[PDB]
């Protein structure tokens with residue numbers, strides 16, 4: 001039995017999204033065998049770790065840190081600034097909206113507190129997540145963070161984080177950012193940030209992909225080269241490979257089709273080949289889950305319907321895909 005993280009030890013870290021339930025049972029053994037990086041799937045998000053101004057919730061993340069230290073793993077810090085899973089208190093000032101400097105002060109305190117607690121075990125932080133506008137042609141998503149703080153908010157977040165993160169690298173994280181439209185936009189944003197002295201080390205390519213994307217391998221190569229040209233590290237942060245196109249909302253499938261499993265094995269083999277080709281600029285590859293038993297894809301984009309997006313099947317066994325990505329020299 002070949003260990004994924006050992007097989008890729010000269011290439012990049014190998015990670016998984018986790019919650020505390022993953023430290024038990026068969027997920028626990030998969031993690032210790034195959035993974036040397038952990039990302040809290042939810043527990044370090046603002047709403048979860050800091051639900052009220054005067055209340056932090058550290059128990060779950062403390063457990064994730066403790067497990068990591070006990071098993072010679074390190075964490076990715078996901079995520080400080082995001083338009084989702086952020087509580088309303090941050091943007092409120094009694095019965096008014098909070099002004100720019102009040103939100104900044106709250107953010108400073110949030111980042112100070114979280115980063116101080118976990119900087120010893122976190123090797124990479126998703127400082128800002130999904131700030132690039134995904135649909136319209138404007139550069140930046142118009143979230144409450146962007147609206148209230150203004151366009152400098154990204155730089156402001158990175159400068160604050162840099163005070164408290166030590167050896168930890170600082171990442172900008174996003175989805176669809178291998179696709180040509182978003183890649184161009186993201187390039188412009190990051191280029192501008194770097195020319196303003198923003199201490200950004202790397203770009204996170206979330207890699208929420210599917211088996212039917214014909215442009216994926218070409219897009220991904222374009223993307224890695226483009227981001228690397230800015231002097232940034234690349235991490236693959238949330239890899240999973242759905243058996244459905246985004247807009248296929250069918251709910252009838254009880255198991256994937258044979259075509260689905262073979263295609264999946266192929267796409268996994270192909271993307272990991274690309275990851276090895278660009279190993280000079282890629283420092284970590286994380287999967288958004290461990291086995292098909294627990295995946296956010298079971299409820300997104302369709303509530304209550306099963307998907308099979310990962311490297312271990314619903315019983316915890318390595319899939320054909322797993323053996324394809326460890327088959328190399």
Ligand SMILES: O[C@@H]1[C@@H](O)[C@H](O[C@@H]2CO[C@@H](O)[C@H](O)[C@H]2O)OC[C@H]1O
Pocket residue numbers: 041042129130174175206238296
């Ligand atoms: O449990 C779910 C998470 O897995 C999900 O994670 C998000 C997926 O989209 C990405 O763009 C984000 O970076 C990542 O945090 O969040 C929702 C939650 O219900």
